[PDB]
Amino acid sequence: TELQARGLTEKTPDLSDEDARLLTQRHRVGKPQFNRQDHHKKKRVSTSWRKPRGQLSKQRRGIKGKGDTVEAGFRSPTAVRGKHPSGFEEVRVHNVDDLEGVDGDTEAVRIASKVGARKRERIEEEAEDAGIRVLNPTYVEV
Amino acid sequence: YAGLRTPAESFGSGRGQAHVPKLDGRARRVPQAVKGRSAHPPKTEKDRS
Amino acid sequence: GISYSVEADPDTTAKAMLRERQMSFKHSKAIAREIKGKTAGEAVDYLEAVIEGDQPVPFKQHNSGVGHKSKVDGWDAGRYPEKASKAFLDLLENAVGNADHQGFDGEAMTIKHVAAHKVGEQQGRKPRAMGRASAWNSPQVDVELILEEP
Amino acid sequence: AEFDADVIVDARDCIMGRVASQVAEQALDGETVAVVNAERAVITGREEQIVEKYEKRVDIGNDNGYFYPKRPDGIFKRTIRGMLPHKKQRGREAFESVRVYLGNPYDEDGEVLDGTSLDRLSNIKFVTLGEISETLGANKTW
RNA sequence: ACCCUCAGAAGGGAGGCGAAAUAGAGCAUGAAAUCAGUUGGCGAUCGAGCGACAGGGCAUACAAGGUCCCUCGACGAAUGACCGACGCGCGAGCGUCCAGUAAGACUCACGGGAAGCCGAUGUUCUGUCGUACGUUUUGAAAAACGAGCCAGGGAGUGUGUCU
RNA sequence: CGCUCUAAUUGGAUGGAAGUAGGGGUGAAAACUCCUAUGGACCGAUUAGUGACGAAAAUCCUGGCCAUAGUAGCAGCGAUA
RNA sequence: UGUCCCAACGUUGGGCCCGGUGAACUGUACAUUCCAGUGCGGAGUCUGGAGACACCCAGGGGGAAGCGAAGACCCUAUGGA
Numbered sequence A: 001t002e003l004q005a006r007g008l009t010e011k012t013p014d015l016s017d018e019d020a021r022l023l024t025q026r027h028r029v030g031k032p033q034f035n036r037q038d039h040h041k042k043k044r045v046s047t048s049w050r051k052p053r054g055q056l057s058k059q060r061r062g063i064k065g066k067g068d069t070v071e072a073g074f075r076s077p078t079a080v081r082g083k084h085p086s087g088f089e090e091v092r093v094h095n096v097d098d099l100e101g102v103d104g105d106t107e108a109v110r111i112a113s114k115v116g117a118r119k120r121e122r123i124e125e126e127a128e129d130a131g132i133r134v135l136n137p138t139y140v141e142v
Numbered sequence B: 001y002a003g004l005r006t007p008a009e010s011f012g013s014g015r016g017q018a019h020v021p022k023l024d025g026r027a028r029r030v031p032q033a034v035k036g037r038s039a040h041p042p043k044t045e046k047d048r049s
Numbered sequence C: 001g002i003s004y005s006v007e008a009d010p011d012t013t014a015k016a017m018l019r020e021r022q023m024s025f026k027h028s029k030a031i032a033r034e035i036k037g038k039t040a041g042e043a044v045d046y047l048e049a050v051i052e053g054d055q056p057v058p059f060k061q062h063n064s065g066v067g068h069k070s071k072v073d074g075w076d077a078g079r080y081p082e083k084a085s086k087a088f089l090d091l092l093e094n095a096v097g098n099a100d101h102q103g104f105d106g107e108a109m110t111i112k113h114v115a116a117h118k119v120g121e122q123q124g125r126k127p128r129a130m131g132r133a134s135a136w137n138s139p140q141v142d143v144e145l146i147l148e149e150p
Numbered sequence D: 001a002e003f004d005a006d007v008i009v010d011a012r013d014c015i016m017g018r019v020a021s022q023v024a025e026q027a028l029d030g031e032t033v034a035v036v037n038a039e040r041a042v043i044t045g046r047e048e049q050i051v052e053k054y055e056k057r058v059d060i061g062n063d064n065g066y067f068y069p070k071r072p073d074g075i076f077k078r079t080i081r082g083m084l085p086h087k088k089q090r091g092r093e094a095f096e097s098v099r100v101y102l103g104n105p106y107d108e109d110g111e112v113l114d115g116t117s118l119d120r121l122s123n124i125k126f127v128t129l130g131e132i133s134e135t136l137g138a139n140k141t142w
Numbered sequence E: 001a002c003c004c005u006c007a008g009a010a011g012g013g014a015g016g017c018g019a020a021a022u023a024g025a026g027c028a029u030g031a032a033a034u035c036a037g038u039u040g041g042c043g044a045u046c047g048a049g050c051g052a053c054a055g056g057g058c059a060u061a062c063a064a065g066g067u068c069c070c071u072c073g074a075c076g077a078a079u080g081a082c083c084g085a086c087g088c089g090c091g092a093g094c095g096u097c098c099a100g101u102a103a104g105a106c107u108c109a110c111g112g113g114a115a116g117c118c119g120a121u122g123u124u125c126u127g128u129c130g131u132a133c134g135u136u137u138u139g140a141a142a143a144a145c146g147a148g149c150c151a152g153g154g155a156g157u158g159u160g161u162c163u
Numbered sequence F: 001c002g003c004u005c006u007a008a009u010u011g012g013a014u015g016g017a018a019g020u021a022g023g024g025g026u027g028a029a030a031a032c033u034c035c036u037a038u039g040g041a042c043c044g045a046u047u048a049g050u051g052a053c054g055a056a057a058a059u060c061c062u063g064g065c066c067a068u069a070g071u072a073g074c075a076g077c078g079a080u081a
Numbered sequence G: 001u002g003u004c005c006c007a008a009c010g011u012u013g014g015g016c017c018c019g020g021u022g023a024a025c026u027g028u029a030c031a032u033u034c035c036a037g038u039g040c041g042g043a044g045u046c047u048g049g050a051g052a053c054a055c056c057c058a059g060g061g062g063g064a065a066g067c068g069a070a071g072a073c074c075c076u077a078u079g080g081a
């Protein structure tokens, strides 16, 4: 009578103290949008980042208010870089065999969108039995 | 010779227009022109072995 | 052409449309805007009064150079677009007709939805001085109308 | 017409600029102030040079307009406006919870703010707002 | 097809076909510019590179993010007191002790709480900074040059020889 | 990082591919990825290659479109109808 | 002898309002400005003040170093005729 998601939906990974600390830092510190200079002033100028190259560019010259310029200093902590917000490391899955070798305590699985419902059902039931959480689960009315 | 079969000429300065070769009011020949030549296209003379 | 842009319950609703009408699109927005919410019958009387010249149609957006009209309420500029008004009378005629054929009280129904859409331009060319020609086009207008029981 | 002032300041024999500075400060801190006996407020210096300055302000102007007040009423209020960011929300709010009066429309006497008092026995080079206004051509209604 | 409407082989309405007519004729898909109607936010006393970063208002079906807030406690870097006592200074004030103590960003635990609630997204308000972009130039917001807007098109390529 | 096509290895798709729209997640970033709607037939990954491979600009090109604007004109001529 | 002192009244067609028809020039963006200042020394946009409730009609054109034309003048090019 209501929608229910398949699999270990609420499962959390177990992280060292240092990892939980760094995951928490990343989440607290965040980062600037880093959109291209003046993308908001002209529709033909998309948001996708491009190093400001103008000799006179205010952003290139680093004037406060013109937005931050991409620099390595903005990189996230190595120990957590790329982790799903839950803390899980993500593993791209296209079939049941891709589930082999995946540690459900440390990794969660993400079924490629291309995968069909028939094959998703098998993958979803095999992952649950393997103790692996599926980040993009199917909702069935149970 | 693709894009080069035209006597198109530029009007130069004077009519408030970019100096682009035109024929019958249509821009032609140059690479930025639709129906113009290909600037650096695949070439038969290239040794592919 | 357009498709009705608003949902309509067939059991308590009646529809109508005008297609590619060659009339002022700007006048149509003004008229639609003015009759929405009215009763089919009120709209009709209103439009006839516009054509007769006794009631001005407020021109709130396409108003440059338009002279003020004392009878315009809450606004200043207005006019009497008789052509687009007549086209709207055909629309209402069709609408109320359909309404009655369905068993409804046509004239009594409320104009729930009415909007004009520019579907195109019939192109024309006009010779000008100095050996050149310029555009001389006609707007093409579609207009949707949905009547609804009170 | 009734002004619930949290403070009623008496400008009599008080240095206009010094009072203005404190009333602005308080108004910004949320206080509702009523300055009373404006015509009796005072400004030090040579009457001849002081009046020249206020006469110049009356003569300045053009189509855009430079409307300068002539009554001690408005002179004082403008003086206060110059110590407030009256074009900002917070500034306009403060300025608007401040009012100056000719005489004292209240039953309660106003208080003399510290440091703003001028001693007539020790000073002879000063003028009165009322005097300035009369020279400017104001209608001595007070 | 039939029926209704209409001056009407127009158009419209209803209806029939098909998995689909939002496949009904330049009839696969259907971006942006942009137009009509409409929803959220702002709005007829207020100021202009249109934002970046902080922080408030209001708005939010699901899914793909799940956090967040308050008491208290633990930890506690640089920094770092009040009060009190004693002692100096014309004075503002200072010294010594209390004391590198209390406090101290982050993080965590207990207990309580939030689900438009936390993130995020839309818009708006406040604070700080801020006169586009590219080019020319010693010097560009420039009263120097270029562009109305959007989409698509649009510039180190080949042979031979040399290094 | 992204684009095209070739090859080897290896996968996805009518139990719904590409694309598009809106929205969630990751990456300093190029950009990657998922969800929902639409769509209705194709689509990847890795490795080695290939190159008519990336645009905000050139009074750049072509197409489409807005404001201009319901504005100018639809008067002027010895033929005022 | 209205060229002038010194302008007036009148006539016809426009102009203005209404129906219908219906373009073009121009447009980096923002833009209610004014006085000073500053700045590549000639600013609606920077600074400081002043003024400023929104929208619309008619007008004569002060400003946008207005729009239109890659200055014709001057010089330069191991340019042309």
Ligand SMILES: [Cl-]
Pocket (backbone or CB within 6 Å): A072, A075
């Ligand atoms: Cl790196």
Ligand SMILES: [Cl-]
Pocket (backbone or CB within 6 Å): C025, C026, C118, C139
């Ligand atoms: Cl139109």
Ligand SMILES: [Cl-]
Pocket (backbone or CB within 6 Å): D060, D061, D062, D063, D064, D065, D066, D067
């Ligand atoms: Cl004035």
Ligand SMILES: [Cl-]
Pocket (backbone or CB within 6 Å): D084, D085, D086, D087, D088, D091
């Ligand atoms: Cl202010």
Ligand SMILES: [Cl-]
Pocket (backbone or CB within 6 Å): D122, D123, D124, D125
């Ligand atoms: Cl004295």
Ligand SMILES: [Cl-]
Pocket (backbone or CB within 6 Å): A021, A025, E106, E107
């Ligand atoms: Cl930490």
Ligand SMILES: [Cl-]
Pocket (backbone or CB within 6 Å): E156
């Ligand atoms: Cl190169």
Ligand SMILES: [Mg+2]
Pocket (backbone or CB within 6 Å): A038, A039, A040, A041, A042, A043, A044, A045, A046, A047
């Ligand atoms: Mg943009």
Ligand SMILES: [Mg+2]
Pocket (backbone or CB within 6 Å): B002, B003, B035, B036, B037, B038
């Ligand atoms: Mg070609």
Ligand SMILES: [Mg+2]
Pocket (backbone or CB within 6 Å): C064, C065, C066, C067
């Ligand atoms: Mg007019």
Ligand SMILES: [Mg+2]
Pocket (backbone or CB within 6 Å): C130, C131
């Ligand atoms: Mg001719």
Ligand SMILES: [Mg+2]
Pocket (backbone or CB within 6 Å): none
């Ligand atoms: Mg189609």
Ligand SMILES: [Mg+2]
Pocket (backbone or CB within 6 Å): F009, F010, F046, F047
């Ligand atoms: Mg492989």
Ligand SMILES: [Mg+2]
Pocket (backbone or CB within 6 Å): none
């Ligand atoms: Mg391209």
Ligand SMILES: [Mg+2]
Pocket (backbone or CB within 6 Å): E134, F057
């Ligand atoms: Mg460039």
Ligand SMILES: [Mg+2]
Pocket (backbone or CB within 6 Å): F071
């Ligand atoms: Mg105009």
